């Protein structure tokens, strides 16, 4: 009911890194404090590392196990965007803002970081556990994928959106907004594929899959809180970032056809600023009674 519509929306959102000139960001970058520059670098590396997993494994593995030519084509298109567009875009932002040696060090740090690794390996673990012709294992991986696309990226997206909403780092913020817009549709699409599997299950199996999804969400959420404090306490933003994580967790759940887990909260306004009945002809004698 939905693949051709998503095909259309995906291909009409096509874009390339070269379209946004990045050099003018140096005019606001130079005015940020060390903690702001440090947080930005670390967040950016976090997003880059997670998105690489999605391009190399997440999207291609789902495309491999999903049946249907049109679904495979949409999934291929999404994998292409990860590897050919998003990955080059993140690299471009880095090369503009930091010298080569600084980039290498930030990636070394984020590669060793406990909270980034915990979530990256949890997601990758579920992708590696998919078994041929087993729709339960595929569903679990789709849940992981939706959580990455619609939830885990957002502790990171917060900061570029925060600057973007203030008039700072506008070129890289525009790029991030385009990336985020792609991840949103990726999350919705994979969510619909997961619901299709979920709806084929018994009531007991459904309850079991719901417990899986909520348990996974809880593990990721508790690690996100730690990840958040680790990066954002030094710039005083953690409270507001936490509200943004929960709001996006609820969107991820709704993508999977589940109820929201967290109470509704308002979001930081700066980040917000960054962000037929059947026709039957009258046959006559219908005018007479």
């Amino acid at each position: 009911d939905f693949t051709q519509m998503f095909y259309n929306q995906n291909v009409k959102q096509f874009w390339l890194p070269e379209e946004i000139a990045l050099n003018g960001d140096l005019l606001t970058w130079k005015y940020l404090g060390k903690n702001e520059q440090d947080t930005y670098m670390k967040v950016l590396a976090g997003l880059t590392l997670l998105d690489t997993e999605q391009g190399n494994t997440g999207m291609p593995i789902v495309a491999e196990h999903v049946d249907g030519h049109q679904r495979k084509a949409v999934l291929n298109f999404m994998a292409m965007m990860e590897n050919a567009v998003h990955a080059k875009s993140y690299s471009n932002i880095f090369m503009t803002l930091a010298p080569t040696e600084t980039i290498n060090e930030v990636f070394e740090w984020v590669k060793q970081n406990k909270y980034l690794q915990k979530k990256a390996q949890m997601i990758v673990g579920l992708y590696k556990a998919i078994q041929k012709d087993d729709e339960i294992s595929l569903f679990k991986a789709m849940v992981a994928s939706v959580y990455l696309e619609s939830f885990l990226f957002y502790s990171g997206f917060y900061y570029p959106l925060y600057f973007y909403g203030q008039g700072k780092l506008m070129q890289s913020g525009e790029i991030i907004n385009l990336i985020l817009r792609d991840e949103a549709i990726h999350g919705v699409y994979v969510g619909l594929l997961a619901q299709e599997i979920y709806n084929k299950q018994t009531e007991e199996k459904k309850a079991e899959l719901r417990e899986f999804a909520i348990d996974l969400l809880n593990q990721l959420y508790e690690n996100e809180l730690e990840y958040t404090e680790d990066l954002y306490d030094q710039v005083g933003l953690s409270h507001d970032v936490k509200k943004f994580i929960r709001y996006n967790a609820n969107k991820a759940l709704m993508n999977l056809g589940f109820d929201p887990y967290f109470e509704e909260e308002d979001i930081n306004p700066i980040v917000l600023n960054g962000l037929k009945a059947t026709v039957e002809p009258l046959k006559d004698d219908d005018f007479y009674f």
């Binding site: 009945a277 009258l282 219908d286």
Partner: protein, 683 residues
Amino acid sequence: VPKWIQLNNEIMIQKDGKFQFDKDKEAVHSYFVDYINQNTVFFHNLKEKLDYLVENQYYEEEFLSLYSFEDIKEVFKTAYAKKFRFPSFMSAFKFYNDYALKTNDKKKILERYEDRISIVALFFANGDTEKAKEYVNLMINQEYQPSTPTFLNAGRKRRGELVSCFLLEVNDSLNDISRAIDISMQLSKLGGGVSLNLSKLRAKGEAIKDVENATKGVVGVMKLLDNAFRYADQMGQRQGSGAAYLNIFHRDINDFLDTKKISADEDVRVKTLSIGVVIPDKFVELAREDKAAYVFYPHTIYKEYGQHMDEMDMNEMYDKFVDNPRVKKEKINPRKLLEKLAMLRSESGYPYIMFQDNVNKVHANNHISKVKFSNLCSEVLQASQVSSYTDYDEEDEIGLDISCNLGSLNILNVMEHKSIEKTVKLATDSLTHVSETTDIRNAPAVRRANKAMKSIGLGAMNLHGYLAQNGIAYESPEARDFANTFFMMVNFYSIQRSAEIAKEKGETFDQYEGSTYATGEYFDKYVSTDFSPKYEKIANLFEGMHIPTTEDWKKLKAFVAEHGMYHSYRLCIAPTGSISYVQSSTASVMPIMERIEERTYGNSKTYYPMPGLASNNWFFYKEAYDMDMFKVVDMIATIQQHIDQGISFTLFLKDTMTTRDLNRIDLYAHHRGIKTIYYARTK
């Protein structure tokens, strides 16, 4: 979750295969012993309460100053002597959330049900202690319910207007269009729903002083009105609701309808303005004969004849319009237009359908004007004269813009008390008082029409509740017999009260002498046909009450001829959406949508069973969607024959049925004399 919420949710938890309806009662007790009594503000006596409400700008002191405090105390004691108890949790919840007076910060409850009823009764009586006690007994027995504006705002300092609906005639001029926008914003600020007749506005592609293809048509005015209603949205509390009515013979009728298509572009789509279509009998005749029809350009007709297209009878002037070369027209397929209407109503429930000839064949005030459009709920059908709003520094010719006060009889409570006559007369007096104390300083035509027409709307609620609680199927002929007798009684006593008010005040409504009330034509079917019940069960239901016969109707006709009538219009059956909850009544004369309705409030969910629903009357509470719409049309026509204005008739459709079924229902309604059709709600 609150205790009363759990008790109310315990209804659906079946015990021995049956719903736990009695649990609902427990919920109300909880809702009062845990929330209402704790959140209520108690004073040492009534004097301190009244003083606090007066000085803190909660109450108007003028209406309370007409009574000595002893009289007010007696009225409040009369209200509290009934020991009224809400039989369902949702009744009390709806009253204390929508109608009970709260503090400025809305943290406490200042008004109980008895307090609100006493204040409304004291406002109604206008200094008469005995009349105030009569109103208190009428409302605490829940025989009569003032409309939501009147019930909520009577006697309040921070109140809006007591009139629910306003109907505006828009003349074909920029000055008149701007004045209509201004008046719509003013009346939406006052809280009332505004309906505008756009049939006089010239269509798209007409000439503005000899430059042709210049007008934007009714769609531009529709966009202006939509933005005006969006801006004036009751200070952001309730979304501004407007209605636009267009004659089906207007050239813009398609574009009009295209405002409600789900595929409409943003420059055409209108989302906060309801649409209604006025269909003369000529259009139905053309569609029936499959002859291609013609929609007309209003300005060409006005230039040729000196009158607006909707100002004269299309049944006699359509051929003259078609054969006149100086009149511009476009060819349409009337059957295709009917199918478009059915498709639009299936998709969105719009447009409202007003059968103009059905309204005007029994309209008593055709001499003043024919009814050319209806209100936002498509139940007000009154004569209106368009106003000529001229340039600045020029005197405006003020016409008549329809406005009536709503009030509903609770059929179950009225018939249980065997007090059709007393309830009807007291409700007529209360509506007359509401009309008299209404003075709108920014709508001149509305003010003039209120002063002259003196039109009121006396509706009815709990028809299906009374029928189901008495073991009568809503679609049965016995139910239609009951409706015939009951509403003939209501019409008889409303006419009697109107004539008595005219006698006691020595004045009738303006231009009453040309009405069918003055000539005696209105009483024809009442002086030749007997409307007593034809079934023994209905006659037993009406026992203890004097059913008027042809002799009583002849005496009433003579009384009206001698004294006249105070009200041009008396009876109109409004939807009665949320105030039906407080009265523990089914909405209007419509059949119930569902036996138990699940409504989400806050983060909680509540279930409201229909009033009196139980095991023995479960199948008598048949859902409207499961009912034959033809028999519902028969019921509505039976009621309509005794109602001078219209009835808000909502069609309840199943998803399986096609647009052809909707068109058949509409054509049967037109055949049976249905004046207006409100909504096409699909399950």
